[PDB]
Amino acid sequence: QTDMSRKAFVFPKESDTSYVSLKAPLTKPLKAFTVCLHFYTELSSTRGYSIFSYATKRQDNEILIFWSKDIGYSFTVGGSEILFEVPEVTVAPVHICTSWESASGIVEFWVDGKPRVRKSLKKGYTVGAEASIILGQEQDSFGGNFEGSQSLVGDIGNVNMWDFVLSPDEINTIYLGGPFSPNVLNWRALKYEVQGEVFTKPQLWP
Amino acid sequence: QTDMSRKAFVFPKESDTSYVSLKAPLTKPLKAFTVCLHFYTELSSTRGYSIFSYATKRQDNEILIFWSKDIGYSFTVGGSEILFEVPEVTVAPVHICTSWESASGIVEFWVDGKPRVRKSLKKGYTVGAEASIILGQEQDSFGGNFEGSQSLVGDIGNVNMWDFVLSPDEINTIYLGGPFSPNVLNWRALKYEVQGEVFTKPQLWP
């Protein structure tokens, strides 16, 4: 249990080994959640990458934010997947926030502090509590089957998970860096382990 | 009668069922009005959508703001229709305000807080008091004949209707979120009912 505030996970090599298994006390399968994270990578104009990965023994990509190469942010829940069109991707750190829910399938994918229009996904679906959250790898199984092409080779931090859809003002505040209580997983109270050549050093973004 | 401030209607699926019938105490056929609403959707670059719909037993689109696909905002009054050219539509929430009047046919279509040049429409025409205001559907009848292609699949809120053309400073204030008295229909004092898969949750836009 380490506080990662003002620090980010160093992802500098494309590989199937670089990753970080983020532990979470989550026990009840999530009927609603929100993952916020400030990441930064220049692979946006070279290939896609797993921005954030969440697996289950049933679903390898139970919750996964990925850079659809040449199309923006593909966010997936429970295998099913939706896509947020990024008209132009800039070389600059970006703070994403996706807020899928299991009733209305609603996803407030706040990007760089700005909102992406809510779109249905996996409506009335329960996210498996047991998870092998990982970064840098689109896991095709529970923390396994990693691919460099699908890997993040930049850096990422502020990874916070809530069991509820944060209010838009709350998401704004997460962007502003104010306090929060990410019950499911919290960057400032983050339990995790590192595998491969992933380091960890002070986050670039403000 | 529910206050929808800081909340928006969740429109996440293209369908002819998703809609919200907004009740209004309006009794005298409107010789002048103004609808302001902050909506957000990415269909702007995929197809058109009914941003706001207002029907009568005589006219199905008695008052209707729609996204003319590849041409901006088509605003219609009493069947007749005018079009505001949007040179480029950005993925971002926008606050529209149209102000048709029955004497000069004038329409101050304030968009994103900025004005669209006044243009005549339906001059000397009375808007039917009885209405089946709906969102997400270009109704070809009184609250009926909905089409997914003509449907809004984003979200919308701050839907306020006045029986008078608000002063431009007043419209600015509506954009700023200050207080107002939308006699005809008021988001903060909104009477309505929901049909289809439309949810309602905290509005994304500031």
């Epitope: 896609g48 990509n61 990925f66 850079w67 659809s68 190469k69 199309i71 593909s74 997936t76 829940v77 295998g79 099913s80 997947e81 939706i82 896509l83 947020f84 399938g105 779109k119 249905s120 996904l121 996996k122 689109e138 699908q150 | 699926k13 293209e14 995929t46």
Partner: nanobody, 119 residues
């Protein structure tokens, strides 16, 4: 056995509309992010468009607005409405089903395609 249905093709005068079908055995397309590729003669196996499992869709710049791909989950018959078919569009359209949206290049199950002639 997958045998992506390739139908709804034929001859259409340029800038018209034609409904391409994409039916799936069982419910497979539910997990697949299915996509239409244009294998035009002397041309590539490039994707004209694609649609995510959830329902969101993308169309390549050359096809922006040109066509609209939707997921028909009732029978796995994802439909593709082609509007304003310019001559370039003339090609054989391969409706393939890869699994997730990021991995456009993989195709897994392969079909036969449907011809399109823009006159």
């Amino acid at each position: 056995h997958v045998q992506l249905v390739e139908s709804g093709g034929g001859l259409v005068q340029a800038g018209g509309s034609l409904r391409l079908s994409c039916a799936a055995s069982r419910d497979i397309f539910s997990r697949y992010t299915v996509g239409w590729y244009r294998q035009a003669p002397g041309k590539q196996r490039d994707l004209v468009a694609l649609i995510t499992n959830g329902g969101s869709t993308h169309y390549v710049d050359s096809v922006k607005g040109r066509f609209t791909i939707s997921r028909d989950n009732a029978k796995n018959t994802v439909y593709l409405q082609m509007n304003s078919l310019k001559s370039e569009d003339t090609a054989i359209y391969y409706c393939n089903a890869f699994r997730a949206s990021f991995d456009r290049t993989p195709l897994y199950s392969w079909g036969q395609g449907t011809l399109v002639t823009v006159s």
